Amino acid sequence: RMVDLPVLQPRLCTHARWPAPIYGLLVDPSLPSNPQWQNGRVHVDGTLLGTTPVSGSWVSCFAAEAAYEFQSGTGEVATFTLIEQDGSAYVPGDRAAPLGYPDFSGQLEIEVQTETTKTGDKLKVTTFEMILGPTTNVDQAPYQGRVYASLTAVASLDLVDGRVRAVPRSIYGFQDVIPEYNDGLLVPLAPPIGPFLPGEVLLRFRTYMRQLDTADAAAEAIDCALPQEFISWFASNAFTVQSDALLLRYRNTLTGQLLFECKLYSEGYIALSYSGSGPLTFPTDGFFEVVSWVPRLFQLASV
Amino acid sequence: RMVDLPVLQPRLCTHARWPAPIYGLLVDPSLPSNPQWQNGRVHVDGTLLGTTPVSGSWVSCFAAEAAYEFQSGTGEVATFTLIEQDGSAYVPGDRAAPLGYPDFSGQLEIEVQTETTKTGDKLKVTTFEMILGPTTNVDQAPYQGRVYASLTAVASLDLVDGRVRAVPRSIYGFQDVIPEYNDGLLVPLAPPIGPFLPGEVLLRFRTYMRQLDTADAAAEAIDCALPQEFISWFASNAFTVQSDALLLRYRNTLTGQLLFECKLYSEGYIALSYSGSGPLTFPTDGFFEVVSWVPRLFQLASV
Amino acid sequence: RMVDLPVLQPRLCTHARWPAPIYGLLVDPSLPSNPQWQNGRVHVDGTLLGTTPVSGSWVSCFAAEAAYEFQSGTGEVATFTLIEQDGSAYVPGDRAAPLGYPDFSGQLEIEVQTETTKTGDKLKVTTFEMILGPTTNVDQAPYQGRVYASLTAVASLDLVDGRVRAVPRSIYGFQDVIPEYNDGLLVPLAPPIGPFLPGEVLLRFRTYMRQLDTADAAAEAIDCALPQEFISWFASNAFTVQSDALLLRYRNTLTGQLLFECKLYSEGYIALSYSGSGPLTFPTDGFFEVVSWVPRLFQLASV
Amino acid sequence: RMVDLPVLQPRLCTHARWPAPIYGLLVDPSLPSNPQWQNGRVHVDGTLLGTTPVSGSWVSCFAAEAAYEFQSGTGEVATFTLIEQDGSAYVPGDRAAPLGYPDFSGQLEIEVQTETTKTGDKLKVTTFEMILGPTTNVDQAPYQGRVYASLTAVASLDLVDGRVRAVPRSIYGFQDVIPEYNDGLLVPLAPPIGPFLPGEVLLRFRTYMRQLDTADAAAEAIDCALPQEFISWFASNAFTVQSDALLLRYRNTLTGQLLFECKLYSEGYIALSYSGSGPLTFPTDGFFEVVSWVPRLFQLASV
Amino acid sequence: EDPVTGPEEVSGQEQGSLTVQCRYTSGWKDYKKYWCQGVPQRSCKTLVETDASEQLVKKNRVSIRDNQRDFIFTVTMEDLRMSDAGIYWCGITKGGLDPMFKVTVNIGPVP
Amino acid sequence: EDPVTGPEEVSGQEQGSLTVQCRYTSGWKDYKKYWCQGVPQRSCKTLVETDASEQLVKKNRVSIRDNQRDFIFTVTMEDLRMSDAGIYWCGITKGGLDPMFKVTVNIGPVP
Ligand SMILES: C[C@H](CCC(=O)NCC(=O)O)[C@H]1CC[C@H]2[C@@H]3[C@H](O)C[C@@H]4C[C@H](O)CC[C@]4(C)[C@H]3CC[C@]12C
Ligand SMILES: C[C@H](CCC(=O)NCC(=O)O)[C@H]1CC[C@H]2[C@@H]3[C@H](O)C[C@@H]4C[C@H](O)CC[C@]4(C)[C@H]3CC[C@]12C
Ligand SMILES: C[C@H](CCC(=O)NCC(=O)O)[C@H]1CC[C@H]2[C@@H]3[C@H](O)C[C@@H]4C[C@H](O)CC[C@]4(C)[C@H]3CC[C@]12C
Ligand SMILES: C[C@H](CCC(=O)NCC(=O)O)[C@H]1CC[C@H]2[C@@H]3[C@H](O)C[C@@H]4C[C@H](O)CC[C@]4(C)[C@H]3CC[C@]12C
Ligand code: NA
Ligand code: NA
Ligand code: NA
Ligand code: NA
């Protein structure tokens, strides 16, 4: 069956690298042209790349067996022995980390369900600080299945060790650079997004992350190559891939007017022909439609 | 084109009523048989019911214009003037609330991005407590677009009014009962799930919510009728519906062994013919496949 | 078009494995007969093998994104995330390293442009020490795109992270053995040079590297199969290959006297028929001329 | 045989005036329009002009017999008796200096292999400072075969006199003006590049040199008329020159799209018709192709 | 300056009675006062509420009377049972969030 | 604040013994400690290494024992020969660049 796409508008879709709605659609040649994002990566034939999960609820989260301890001078320290978020054992293999593990850098505030032995309480939700990267002095190694988090406290919180699911609360010092997956060593990674033709630029689906910032109030943008609905759409359909890219049309939902034509490369990224120097945003209430297969050298009309 | 289903395993899918992975698949005749869940409701022809959103990042969340104030004896008080989660205006209409608003009861901890006026700080993430239902003394009216939240504080947090996205952090005193949608008055609701034939019971997709509990450590279960991936799958395809139900087969992914057959009613819920009196859980690493259209009175093989 | 060669003299050519002029031309049966050099490898039809670049300015150099930090007891530490020397992204593929990366062993002194934040200074040229191989305790992995270097310093140099081009300054403890390409694991390599007929030995183009040695003042020789001009000559012309080898004559430029006949094998190396036991050097101011195609079994006249 | 050009891309070529890759391709009428560069000068028939060498490893380097001594109040002082870089004697003749000698001005850091008598060391690489020009008070006379370099030191380095090859480490106070070739006296020079037609400007192949700068972090650009690969291409092929110029087309390697047409004058420089006043850069992943011979007055299409 | 205060912990005995005094600031005089039961706080079940007057109101075993001179409304729980134990709240009804104060009630048998 | 320290120069005698103490900071307690030989520094030949425990390890004539209370691992070289002379290193195994301290070992005859 020939590849098709859902009629979903981007503004009603889920971001693939941070669990939030998609708010923006744009091209920006001033940003890095070939990002090596590890989440939100799928081939059109349905092969997931990097750490990309099928469910958007796995994005920028992790699951682990948690071991807690109090360290004087630092506070409550958590050692997370990672597991895949469905409960299957994490085995180091041909990807950077467990599925859905964050693929960006900064200090991430995470939330976990904790059980305490203190009388009068039983189940709580505790916020931990976890440094992702680019470099840390904590020796994070999610590739090996071990990450560390901490929280300032004057005494032990008396937490009970056990299974946890960690969800992201905020990001501090965000950088769109892959984190420390293996204590400074490199890991199997999905390759950089690309290549592009002359004049082609990556189409970006943008959301904004909850952040901690002591001076700047501007929202923190993060981009992904495809909405999560498109990621699971390809994973479910398992289309056969014919050419190197698909010619798509982005049209206004109500009128049908064509907003731009673009190429969905089979490697999982959308390209537009745009020669401008600054960002160019597009309406988020349109829809994509598959036109046909095209070769790599197919020249798009400029937008 | 004849109705088909994604090959996705339930354990890799997203829950439709609480933003978490699906962990369980079961029937339980001791639970309410015709729940009136407002999220996770879609017809097989693609019509969304109740407050069901397409994106899982909308589930049990809301967006609003936030106004903050300090009230002695209460704390920091938030008045949320609701808006649809994509920014389009919320108009009270033929559903209970904005799309994705919680459809359960209890005390909900929510997180929002807050801006402060304190010198040296700017952007923080603040946890608020918001009572959902079943009844409140707060006059919650999400149907009208106004809800109230609070957090204990000894003084004002010096928050700046502005736009927010609120995501759920934990549930306290959970009840699977619709919340106070309109200050005690009734609202347009999706009908109860059903009806079922004699001996037919609802198939439940289960996750467990982060909870606050001072005594019991047992996980808090919440069920939905379909994975969020299935809701958006039907919403995208707009299938033509022929009969009243679809005969489905749930099979093991690796071996192919048939685990059970079931009926996906066109109204958007799955029924099993089940002769037991107690709960029966099923493996979550299987897949659903459509067999054919069947009439309402079609008799299933018992489980 | 029949293969021809430039009349350029070896003494006026560029070495293909260390960026220096060619100073010697010789055969030596006491050295390893079948070296697996990764630079300076080209087929006569123009196919580049291993990490061989076309431009001589790429030879034994690398380009990277540099990350700096100070570590007491070690000094200023550089982490080089490799990139191809033209700025295009380096992707681990069907060769050992980025094009032009050193294919020998020892401790390499490299030079990079560094920017500092120290008041009164801005741009300097800094020498780093980088271990190549044969084995290291550093986990060098140029195949994955990450290598580490250091330089002794009593305090931080306050270097700014950024892009660099690294050129070789000197070699310490040189060994003509492929370096640690992948943290001890194997990588795709160009095969050993060969095979040769009985009595045939490899013709070596020799230069001498800037070296560090605390006792021995004798120059450090390094050999390559072809001058860099011949590599770019074959890469540019894309000749059609007829037989297994080309019969060459090395004649004096002024008088024309024939110095030796040799076979240029299609795999990109020259063989001479030489029965001696010790080294035999030849004048470097001669010229090569193509005579005709010959089969692999063509027996050369002894020198 | 009609003149043709290799399909080599500029970004994969070697710069002809500084030993580095080519990073930029541009025209800039605000720069000196008729430069008298002495390196990187060749006729299309293969005739080398000025000090231009065939091998790129000779570019901005020199060879000498070195004499070292310590002078209190100055430091270690080096007297270099220049020699041609292949070891043949340098004789003052019809050019400015030995082949490859730097043709720009500023303070050049050079590196040479030095042997020491100090116990515990033997072979080192020593960095010297050498003033090139435009004017010096040290009486540099590379045309005569004698230049001086020095490095500050509190005591003698115990250096041994001997043969050296000097390679450039960094440039300080760079000026694209010919150095002091003969102690203030005039020398035989390659003529200024030109002439051009009305509206024609010189095409520049640009690299950036390792520099010393205490305030400005902007890269230090240096331009040449042709890539070093083109110089050795004309020197090796010895084409017959017919007209005053060659009509060339610069096309993108992947698509084949025409970027501009230009005139390669037989005197060894490329002209584009460009009426702007500021710089105009071009993509570096194209290739040049010969169209035909044209007269000097052939009018190019504007770019 | 809390809007409404009371005892943090009170204890009664089976078949006995207990009394709870809820003090409030003068501004809440003309507001309805109530006594509610259970957690979560703001979904508790109102057992008895005044009509903003000083009339005594009795519903089942709970009584309430508002003293609008001393600004204290008094709750009385009669014929106590073990199932009466739990968290209660002094409450003042307003639009939105009510002034509320937590009262823990323990019930035991007679020795 | 150096990670690992030791003697800059030690001298032994033929058929004799020498001992080398490498002190490290507390943070490196649970890391493997080693004694390696030769130059270049970071391509040296590891003679003996611990398993990050306090167990004594011996290979041929070289021994290693990590004291994880005083943060000193002690290297012992027995039955020395003149050919044992050279550059050695106290080492702590890590990802990337190892903490290493240069130890020069001289061996002479007995008078
Ligand atoms: C106590 C918590 C329930 C509350 C919770 O954290 N829910 C997640 C959410 O609200 O998003 C339990 C219930 C089910 C548990 C998960 C499931 O048992 C599946 C899985 C099993 C692995 O052994 C550990 C990880 C992992 C993934 C478990 C982590 C902890 C969970 C999530
Ligand atoms: C300050 C925050 C960004 C941080 C954040 O809260 N992100 C949510 C998350 O991380 O999940 C801003 C950035 C974009 C904003 C949203 C968009 O502007 C669209 C929309 C506009 C409406 O006026 C208010 C709601 C709504 C939906 C906005 C809520 C607040 C958002 C989400
Ligand atoms: C600051 C230096 C310029 C000085 C220098 O190191 N020149 C090299 C030499 O003299 O041989 C900059 C100028 C241009 C830069 C290069 C170019 O931008 C191209 C390329 C871009 C990649 O992102 C990083 C590597 C790489 C290859 C860059 C390395 C650093 C360079 C070479
Ligand atoms: C000690 C150095 C070798 C190390 C070195 O400096 N290599 C240059 C590099 O690595 O680029 C020796 C080895 C061969 C020597 C060269 C050859 O003997 C040929 C020639 C002879 C002339 O009398 C002096 C210059 C010149 C050209 C010599 C300069 C010094 C060289 C290059
Ligand atoms: Na920020
Ligand atoms: Na190491
Ligand atoms: Na400068
Ligand atoms: Na109220």
XYZ file of N, CA and C in Angstrom, chain D residues 6 19 29-30 48 55 62 68 73 76 95 97 112 115-116 132 156 175 183 190 214 224 232 260 266 281 295:
81
model
N 40.440 19.463 -13.702
C 39.910 18.418 -12.822
C 38.593 18.854 -12.199
N 49.729 26.755 3.834
C 49.461 25.310 3.795
C 48.230 24.901 4.595
N 35.520 43.335 -4.430
C 36.175 44.474 -5.091
C 36.766 45.481 -4.123
N 36.432 45.405 -2.835
C 36.977 46.337 -1.860
C 38.404 45.990 -1.461
N 55.593 28.302 -14.211
C 55.532 28.846 -12.863
C 56.105 30.256 -12.821
N 54.760 21.547 -5.390
C 54.234 20.823 -4.238
C 53.680 21.792 -3.200
N 60.480 27.098 4.144
C 61.816 27.246 3.589
C 62.723 26.186 4.191
N 73.032 28.534 15.087
C 72.390 29.003 16.305
C 73.423 29.543 17.283
N 70.457 39.724 26.094
C 69.642 40.850 25.705
C 68.739 40.590 24.521
N 67.888 33.325 21.990
C 68.457 32.417 21.003
C 68.247 33.004 19.613
N 63.872 35.582 -9.523
C 62.705 35.573 -8.653
C 63.100 36.096 -7.278
N 62.933 34.895 -4.162
C 63.403 34.100 -3.036
C 63.497 32.639 -3.459
N 61.349 24.318 13.535
C 62.445 23.573 12.938
C 62.828 22.445 13.879
N 68.656 19.897 17.252
C 69.391 18.959 18.083
C 70.101 19.725 19.190
N 70.052 19.185 20.401
C 70.637 19.836 21.562
C 71.749 18.981 22.158
N 58.909 39.051 8.792
C 58.953 38.981 7.337
C 59.021 40.358 6.699
N 71.451 30.027 26.935
C 71.618 29.308 25.678
C 70.821 28.010 25.688
N 49.919 41.055 7.110
C 49.603 42.017 6.066
C 49.822 41.341 4.726
N 66.619 43.304 1.918
C 67.151 44.338 2.810
C 66.760 45.740 2.343
N 57.011 38.546 -9.795
C 55.904 38.287 -10.694
C 55.041 39.544 -10.770
N 45.987 39.562 20.330
C 45.681 39.790 21.735
C 44.299 40.388 21.970
N 44.266 33.332 -2.669
C 45.162 32.979 -3.761
C 44.351 32.870 -5.045
N 49.628 22.468 -10.000
C 50.309 21.236 -10.372
C 49.650 20.578 -11.576
N 27.973 30.245 -11.899
C 28.427 31.411 -12.647
C 29.323 30.934 -13.779
N 44.956 33.227 -19.375
C 46.118 32.368 -19.555
C 47.252 32.730 -18.610
N 30.243 35.784 -1.647
C 30.759 34.433 -1.487
C 29.937 33.442 -2.302
N 38.602 35.453 -26.483
C 39.537 36.583 -26.516
C 39.457 37.386 -25.229
